Amino acid sequence: MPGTKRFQHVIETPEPGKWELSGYEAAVPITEKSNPLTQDLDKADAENIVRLLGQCDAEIFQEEGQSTYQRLYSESILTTMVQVAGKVQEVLKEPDGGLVVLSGGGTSGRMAFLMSVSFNQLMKGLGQKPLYTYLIAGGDRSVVASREGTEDSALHGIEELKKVAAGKKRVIVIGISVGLSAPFVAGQMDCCMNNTAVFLPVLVGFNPVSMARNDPIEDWSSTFRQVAERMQKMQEKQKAFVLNPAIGPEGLSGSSRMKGGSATKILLETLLLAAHKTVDQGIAASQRCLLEILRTFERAHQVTYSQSPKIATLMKSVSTSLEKKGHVYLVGWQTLGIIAIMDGVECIHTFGADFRDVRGFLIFTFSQEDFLTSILPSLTEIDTVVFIFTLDDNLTEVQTIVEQVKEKTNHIQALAHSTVGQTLPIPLKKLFPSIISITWPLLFFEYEGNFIQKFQRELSTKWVLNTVSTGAHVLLGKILQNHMLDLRISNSKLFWRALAMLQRFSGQSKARCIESLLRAIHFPQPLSDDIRAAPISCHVQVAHEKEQVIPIALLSLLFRCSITEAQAHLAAAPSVCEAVRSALA
Ligand SMILES: O=S(=O)(N[C@@H](c1cc2ccccc2s1)c1ccccc1Cl)c1ccc2c(c1)OCCCO2
Ligand SMILES: O=P(O)(O)OC[C@@H](O)[C@@H](O)[C@H](O)[C@@H](O)CO
């Protein structure tokens, strides 16, 4: 029948109680799993949210049990990180015709960009020509934009990679997809494998390959799973690498901007630093060099969440403000400015949030007096501003801008990074009551820019910001258990995540879930055989423009009713969350 093919790969809903025993749960990729630590995340108060998300983030450094999935500290992963450092070094010693590309979509794209800059800085500092570049689904504009639709074309990934690989002779492509999921990446990797004279593909993600996506890519013939299975075979002769440790599920299910973005930096910074440090010394990279850096990143988590109670309070001020239709501003310098901009933007697609609700500023790139005259006027008593800097920044810009903001608003707070025994100039000191200071012990550093100091702080800020943004919106009641129910379907992955959420919360069959989702999407047009048979992009393009697609589809199933009936029920309830909660009872 029509639609049987497009949905061939979908697993049937299990009958109640045999979720485990049907083998459906064992097929849910780790990156899409519900994290059991957060099954009651929607009931936690602010301090528990922080405690629960800090605990989920720490799963990154947790070791393998005794059967089970390799992890970051497993010897198969570290031995792969070594071999990859090894190949990065071959390129470092022959920079003529050599290039290192870091490519991802969404947050994997954002991460790739940061790291390409840093390692380019490092090489400038040594007087060598920069060898790093990034690639982000949707071009470079995507780095600071919410643009979830762009990851779905393989050809587009292959074009972008063909532009940048110019007339180079040895190219390392590090494709980053947390879920081993994005067709953008899949196409790059497959292309590298069709020309291993020039290309070396390295695939980075956090699912076992056996959970990689296996649904058809619209412009391509292989699935992500097949591409990855073929890379893994090539690794035996060291012509491709798959670097995929499990790091456990996300605190908010499928939200791979959190743990997944963090692990991506931890994993790649570690490995590239190791490679640079050890070329200088004319020594091969080794597990022991990687470990030093890895443990430093793991100290960084401890150091960061030891400041939890102040994180919980920044959380509340952020949540309070948005409950009143207020706005929230994130202001910081150099690379922490950017990380602020990334976090705010991600709130758009993650929570259905307006660009103004949580916006980030770099001193989007609005400098000292430009921000004073432009943004400063339009503030208000309920808003919130957050300053993010090190005590090595122009601390004179800092004090100024806060002084003016303290006039137009009082819900300020800040995030400050210091080496130990650095002190807060007394004007600045006095403007912040409960302040978030994070002091970093002395560490001896090989290079001029102190790149390891940079990485720790970027990462620690990421964790604080992500925990605040996510926590703030959970507090508002917009998350259901640990799922975001009311997402906007803007790509095929989210299409599937929606369908899985319908199977999970409805318990009804695969065919009914799918029918209800397509009706919801395409309403007011009815299911035709064309629509049943259409490629997933057709449903995505139409869902992307609508509101409450998933809750409307769920209600339809629970009440066993039409789309007309569920829509009017929804509009006759105080809110979405309210209506779904009641219906779930
Ligand atoms: O497209 S898939 O090959 N892989 C999908 C998913 C697969 C899958 C399987 C069970 C439950 C949820 C999900 S989501 C995938 C894999 C890695 C990273 C992200 C994503 Cl979306 C697929 C496989 C099976 C699916 C399914 C999708 O739709 C969801 C409902 C269950 O059936
Ligand atoms: O790295 P992946 O699995 O290929 O995910 C690619 C992007 O969709 C992902 O980063 C997404 O943008 C974020 O909103 C996840 O919270």
Side-chain angles (χ1 to χ4, degrees), residues 288-307:
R288 202 188 35 64
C289 195
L290 305 170
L291 290 157
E292 294 180 53
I293 302 156
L294 282 163
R295 296 299 187 184
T296 308
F297 285 124
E298 177 176 7
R299 283 197 305 280
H301 178 276
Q302 183 283 317
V303 158
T304 290
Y305 282 80
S306 58
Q307 296 302 21

Side-chain angles (χ1 to χ4, degrees), residues 105-108 148 151 176-182 254-257 349-350 491 493:
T107 315
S108 305
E148 292 275 81
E151 66 170 76
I176 303 166
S177 185
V178 165
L180 293 197
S181 161
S255 190
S256 72
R257 75 200 192 80
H349 59 236
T350 305
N491 53 226
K493 173 172 71 192

Side-chain angles (χ1 to χ4, degrees), residues 9-12 24 27-29 31-32 179-181 207 211-215 225 492-497 499-500 503:
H9 69 271
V10 181
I11 306 304
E12 187 61 66
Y24 178 105
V28 180
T31 63
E32 298 287 318
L180 293 197
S181 161
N207 274 320
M211 283 156 172
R213 284 184 66 182
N214 200 41
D215 66 323
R225 195 130 104 199
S492 48
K493 173 172 71 192
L494 287 166
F495 182 94
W496 303 122
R497 184 175 300 158
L499 179 58
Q503 311 187 278

Side-chain angles (χ1 to χ4, degrees), residues 22-187:
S22 85
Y24 178 105
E25 227 93 78
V28 180
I30 301 161
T31 63
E32 298 287 318
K33 277 185 210 304
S34 174
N35 189 137
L37 300 175
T38 55
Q39 308 283 42
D40 289 319
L41 177 69
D42 55 353
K43 291 156 187 166
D45 79 343
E47 278 79 29
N48 286 267
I49 285 158
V50 170
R51 170 189 59 92
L52 286 183
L53 300 214
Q55 187 159 349
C56 292
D57 297 348
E59 292 174 331
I60 289 170
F61 304 103
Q62 173 192 304
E63 284 191 22
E64 193 173 357
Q66 274 261 103
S67 212
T68 194
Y69 298 127
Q70 63 179 3
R71 314 189 59 102
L72 179 67
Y73 285 125
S74 303
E75 187 200 324
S76 52
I77 297 308
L78 291 153
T79 299
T80 291
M81 302 181 64
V82 162
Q83 295 171 335
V84 170
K87 302 274 170 176
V88 174
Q89 295 177 345
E90 288 185 337
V91 156
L92 292 187
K93 320 274 191 65
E94 170 65 296
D96 267 53
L99 179 68
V100 175
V101 196
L102 302 134
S103 164
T107 315
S108 305
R110 292 184 238 292
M111 291 318 80
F113 157 95
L114 300 181
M115 297 193 306
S116 77
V117 166
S118 296
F119 290 96
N120 279 341
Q121 285 179 182
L122 197 158
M123 299 184 91
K124 87 179 284 78
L126 307 185
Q128 323 178 120
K129 57 154 187 200
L131 296 196
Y132 290 93
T133 197
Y134 66 96
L135 278 188
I136 182 167
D140 295 31
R141 37 212 261 72
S142 283
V143 183
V144 161
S146 175
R147 296 177 66 213
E148 292 275 81
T150 49
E151 66 170 76
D152 280 327
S153 172
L155 298 175
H156 169 223
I158 295 178
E159 277 153 27
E160 293 272 301
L161 173 61
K162 279 172 165 161
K163 275 154 63 197
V164 127
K168 265 88 220 298
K169 312 189 310 207
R170 271 261 98 239
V171 193
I172 289 179
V173 195
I174 306 189
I176 303 166
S177 185
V178 165
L180 293 197
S181 161
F184 186 72
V185 174

Side-chain angles (χ1 to χ4, degrees), residues 283-359:
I283 163 203
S286 71
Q287 313 219 161
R288 202 188 35 64
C289 195
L290 305 170
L291 290 157
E292 294 180 53
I293 302 156
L294 282 163
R295 296 299 187 184
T296 308
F297 285 124
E298 177 176 7
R299 283 197 305 280
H301 178 276
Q302 183 283 317
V303 158
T304 290
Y305 282 80
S306 58
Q307 296 302 21
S308 287
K310 279 64 66 188
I311 293 156
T313 322
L314 214 204
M315 203 165 100
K316 282 171 290 211
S317 170
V318 171
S319 188
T320 311
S321 160
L322 286 158
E323 193 172 37
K324 295 160 123 78
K325 172 56 173 60
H327 292 142
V328 177
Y329 309 68
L330 261 32
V331 192
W333 287 249
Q334 295 149 92
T335 312
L336 290 73
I338 305 163
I339 286 165
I341 292 159
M342 293 170 168
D343 197 76
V345 160
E346 290 164 355
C347 284
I348 292 157
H349 59 236
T350 305
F351 299 118
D354 185 62
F355 76 134
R356 279 262 71 261
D357 289 348
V358 176
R359 218 232 291 201

Side-chain angles (χ1 to χ4, degrees), residues 171-427:
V171 193
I172 289 179
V173 195
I174 306 189
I176 303 166
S177 185
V178 165
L180 293 197
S181 161
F184 186 72
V185 174
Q188 291 162 170
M189 302 293 92
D190 205 343
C191 162
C192 297
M193 289 190 285
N194 299 155
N195 185 26
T196 59
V198 173
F199 297 93
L200 182 83
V202 174
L203 173 59
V204 174
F206 302 99
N207 274 320
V209 166
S210 76
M211 283 156 172
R213 284 184 66 182
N214 200 41
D215 66 323
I217 291 157
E218 192 173 359
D219 52 355
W220 204 248
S221 288
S222 38
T223 61
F224 205 115
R225 195 130 104 199
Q226 292 169 296
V227 172
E229 285 163 346
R230 178 152 88 109
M231 289 181 65
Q232 208 158 36
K233 277 135 49 172
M234 283 186 47
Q235 184 162 338
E236 280 156 8
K237 318 153 310 199
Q238 302 252 121
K239 286 178 179 159
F241 295 90
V242 181
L243 199 30
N244 66 145
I247 69 186
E250 286 291 352
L252 177 53
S253 323
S255 190
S256 72
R257 75 200 192 80
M258 302 180 96
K259 292 172 57 173
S262 309
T264 298
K265 296 183 83 259
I266 285 157
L267 201 145
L268 284 168
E269 289 172 348
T270 293
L271 166 178
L272 294 170
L273 198 48
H276 284 286
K277 288 201 311 191
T278 62
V279 284
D280 282 59
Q281 295 163 42
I283 163 203
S286 71
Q287 313 219 161
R288 202 188 35 64
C289 195
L290 305 170
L291 290 157
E292 294 180 53
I293 302 156
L294 282 163
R295 296 299 187 184
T296 308
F297 285 124
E298 177 176 7
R299 283 197 305 280
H301 178 276
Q302 183 283 317
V303 158
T304 290
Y305 282 80
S306 58
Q307 296 302 21
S308 287
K310 279 64 66 188
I311 293 156
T313 322
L314 214 204
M315 203 165 100
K316 282 171 290 211
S317 170
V318 171
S319 188
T320 311
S321 160
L322 286 158
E323 193 172 37
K324 295 160 123 78
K325 172 56 173 60
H327 292 142
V328 177
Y329 309 68
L330 261 32
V331 192
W333 287 249
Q334 295 149 92
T335 312
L336 290 73
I338 305 163
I339 286 165
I341 292 159
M342 293 170 168
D343 197 76
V345 160
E346 290 164 355
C347 284
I348 292 157
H349 59 236
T350 305
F351 299 118
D354 185 62
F355 76 134
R356 279 262 71 261
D357 289 348
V358 176
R359 218 232 291 201
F361 301 96
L362 171 58
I363 303 88
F364 62 83
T365 177
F366 276 148
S367 82
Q368 198 203 136
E369 293 294 338
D370 194 338
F371 179 90
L372 260 35
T373 41
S374 303
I375 281 81
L376 209 197
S378 63
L379 271 55
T380 162
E381 304 147 291
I382 53 154
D383 286 1
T384 309
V385 197
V386 169
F387 312 82
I388 291 150
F389 50 98
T390 89
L391 314 201
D392 306 57
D393 291 306
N394 199 111
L395 292 112
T396 293
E397 275 173 346
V398 182
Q399 61 189 152
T400 299
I401 296 154
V402 187
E403 264 149 6
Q404 272 107 143
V405 171
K406 261 267 54 159
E407 273 282 66
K408 266 142 182 189
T409 307
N410 65 129
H411 295 299
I412 52 161
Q413 319 217 1
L415 184 79
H417 297 282
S418 35
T419 327
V420 284
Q422 260 158 305
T423 324
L424 291 153
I426 54 170

Side-chain angles (χ1 to χ4, degrees), residues 508-534:
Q508 314 190 205
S509 71
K510 153 189 177 172
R512 292 186 48 80
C513 283
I514 290 160
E515 282 178 325
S516 188
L517 181 49
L518 302 191
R519 287 189 175 113
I521 289 167
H522 290 292
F523 198 82
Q525 302 297 309
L527 273 183
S528 58
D529 280 343
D530 293 9
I531 290 182
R532 289 190 193 251

